[PDB]
Amino acid sequence: VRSSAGAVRDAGGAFGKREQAEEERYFRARAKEQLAALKKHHENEIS
């Protein structure tokens, strides 16, 4: 009897979905700031 790696997501329990939740915060916020920065960049390049 043993365990595996990357198994807190397969169970789909409470943690399996809270983990998706946490990751999705982090990367939604990062995507927002990255989109703003890319905008800023192209708008600056108009000059």
């Binding site: 979905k17 809270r18 998706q20 939740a21 999705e24 915060r25 939604r28 916020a29 927002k32």
Partner: protein
Amino acid sequence: VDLEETGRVLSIGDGIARVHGLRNVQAEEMVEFSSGLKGMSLNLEPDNVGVVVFGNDKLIKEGDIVKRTGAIVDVPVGEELLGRVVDALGNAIDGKGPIGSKARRRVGLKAPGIIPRISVREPMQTGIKAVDSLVPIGRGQRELIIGDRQTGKTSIAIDTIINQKRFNDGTDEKKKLYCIYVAIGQKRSTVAQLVKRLTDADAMKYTIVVSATASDAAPLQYLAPYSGCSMGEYFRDNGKHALIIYDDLSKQAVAYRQMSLLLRRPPGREAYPGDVFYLHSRLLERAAKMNDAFGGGSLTALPVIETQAGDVSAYIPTNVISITDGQIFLETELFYKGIRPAINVGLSVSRVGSAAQTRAMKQVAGTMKLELAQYREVAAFAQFLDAATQQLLSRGVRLTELLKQGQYSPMAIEEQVAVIYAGVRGYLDKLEPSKITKFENAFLSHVISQHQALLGKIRTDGKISEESDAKLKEIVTNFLAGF
């Protein structure tokens, strides 16, 4: 004695009769016992015939005389069955008199081949906002309905059967959809209540109800779905659309398992015979959509399975999930957290899906799919916001509250489009999450009262014209401010 056309029972017991004789009896042919009963010669052994008695065998004794009828099992079909409750054989049990049909039809018949069928194109309006929008159903499509006990499966079926009253009272005939409801393994009380609630909606004038309740001998439960499917194939062949709702199918598998373990056939997995696949496939593959050289009929099938403890990976649930063209996963967790009907989206696919829908509803459902998908990605946050994430959570809550629906109150497709368009266009994101319901309800009446012209325009043209969109937006805003 004539052992070619007539045999004698050898050992009746527990429902199965061995019959010595009947040398000229066909397989799955219907023998009549001397006491009014009927059978079905299933096993043809070298010495005796294993027959299954369609009823209780109190009246069968060793020595009775079994005499074949000469014709493979068959059931009455026709327009004359509509609005009747019939037994699994075709014997009315509503006490309304003789059934009176002018045409029989075999039950163990063959599904239409590859050429007759044509792709699924028309919509089969279910009247449930959660199905017409996200998991649509087309005519000629088989759409499982799988969920634990008491999650609102027969509710989906009865909403579908009631909703077809809009079209069945109209002038058109390419929109009329007659319905058949096969009740396997239920109670007589439940079937009687179902018929009463159908009559209260005057939805029995175009429905049949094949009833093989719990008490009826196992063979009748095993044979009810085929009888219903044949009564529906009659309409399908003759260019009239149809529908059929097996409820449930797992009970047919149990009845077959009993009937096959009493014939001494060896068991398989979970004691089911090996064929419980070929039992359901043989049945469901009859739900076709014939092309225009074969009439253009159809037979939508809505098999209803019950998983044990939300176990979709059981034997029979996975035997049927791989036979049908989609799913409607009723979850018993969403059924308490508030969502009724408990349809679980994201897991509910419709392998035909979008092509079936109507353009008007497609316009809004396309956007609703994405909005709800994003919401469900970040709907896991009772645990704990950003501007966009907060907006997404709010919009998801609004749309979810819109999906909820009453019971036995199907709503026309134009009204569904109105409400969904209101929700997905941002004209709700300020209302209290728990207010939506009342708003929704009230909103209907208003648009039902004054703007029947706009709903009629959407319904007739089938799409939200730009003028239609403008008028709809004006109504939504003038009401929201008037809310």
